[PDB]
Design a binder for this molecule. Structure first.
Ligand SMILES: N=C(N)N1CCCCC1
Length: 279
């Protein structure tokens, strides 16, 4: 398939060069996979989700996304126009309130919920969780991420937006999950992106157009936007049978565009997510 005038991030993950605007991808489009977006919620009624999104859990007074952040992430995973895996199933878990904040115990509770909830769901091609959140180092938050990964879910988490070593943030610092840094449309590390040996991969994270609440759209920046590119790519690759939940992060690293990013510090991988789609 080929989406012309795609958001630059989608085009980027299907090219060996920056500056294209066509997203080339296999038409299976992540059908049969499921991605849990653990965030502020998802506006499931947004037309861009085509009825493929649903809230399954909230930890607050409402299931609604009163922020937009979770809807934006969910749109980069699997919305029609802005999504990597345009036929995946999306499940919303609201661990962050409408200001984008969440306590660590609630985040941990949400991760354990997904590890069990995925046994209620028909996801024959496998299950992904995208966690565009984090905070200061916590061994309990890391273990929760690791438990989710161990249960059979491909966990992708944001490196963080502190322009610092992500070893000091969680779940970013958990070695067994996929930690995602952010890049811009000129293949530079995003100015805010964390770095460090704990990063496994970079994805597009600066000026990312996606769905927003109120049936709208907007462009925002963050490792929070890079994370769902990788989560959507994993769901897409697991639908193609090229990898599994346990190996997707390694597989994405192995097949990444290598050495193409600038302003990567020594000790941080120079790997940019890439679908290697050959039409
Ligand atoms: N609007 C979407 N989802 N597109 C546009 C053109 C081809 C397929 C992807």
């Amino acid at each position: 398939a080929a989406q012309t005038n795609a958001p630059w991030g989608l085009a980027r993950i299907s090219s060996t060069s920056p500056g294209t605007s066509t997203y080339y991808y296999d038409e299976s489009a992540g059908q049969g996979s499921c991605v849990y977006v653990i965030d502020t919620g998802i506006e499931a009624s947004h037309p861009e989700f085509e009825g493929r999104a649903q809230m399954v859990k909230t930890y607050y007074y409402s299931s609604r996304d009163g922020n937009g952040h979770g809807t934006h992430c969910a749109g980069t995973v699997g919305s029609r126009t802005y999504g990597v895996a345009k036929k995946t199933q999306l499940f919303g878990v609201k661990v962050l309130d409408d200001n984008g904040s969440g306590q660590y115990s609630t985040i941990i509770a949400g991760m354990d919920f997904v590890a069990s909830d995925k046994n209620n769901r028909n996801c024959p091609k496998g299950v992904v969780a995208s966690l565009s959140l984090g905070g200061g180092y916590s061994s309990s938050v890391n273990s929760a991420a690791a438990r989710l990964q161990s249960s059979g879910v491909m966990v992708a988490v944001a490196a963080g937006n502190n322009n610092a070593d992500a070893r000091n943030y969680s779940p970013a610092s958990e070695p067994s999950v996929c930690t995602v840094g952010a890049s811009d449309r000129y293949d530079r590390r995003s100015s805010f992106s964390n770095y460090g040996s704990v990063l496994d991969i970079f994805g597009p994270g600066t000026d990312i157009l996606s769905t927003w609440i109120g049936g709208s759209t907007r462009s925002i920046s963050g490792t929070s936007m890079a994370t769902p590119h990788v989560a959507g790519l994993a769901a897409y690759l697991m639908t193609l049978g090229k990898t599994t939940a346990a190996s997707a992060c390694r597989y994405i690293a192995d097949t990444a565009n290598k050495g193409d990013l600038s302003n990567i510090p020594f000790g941080t991988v120079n790997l940019l997510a890439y679908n290697n789609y050959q039409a």
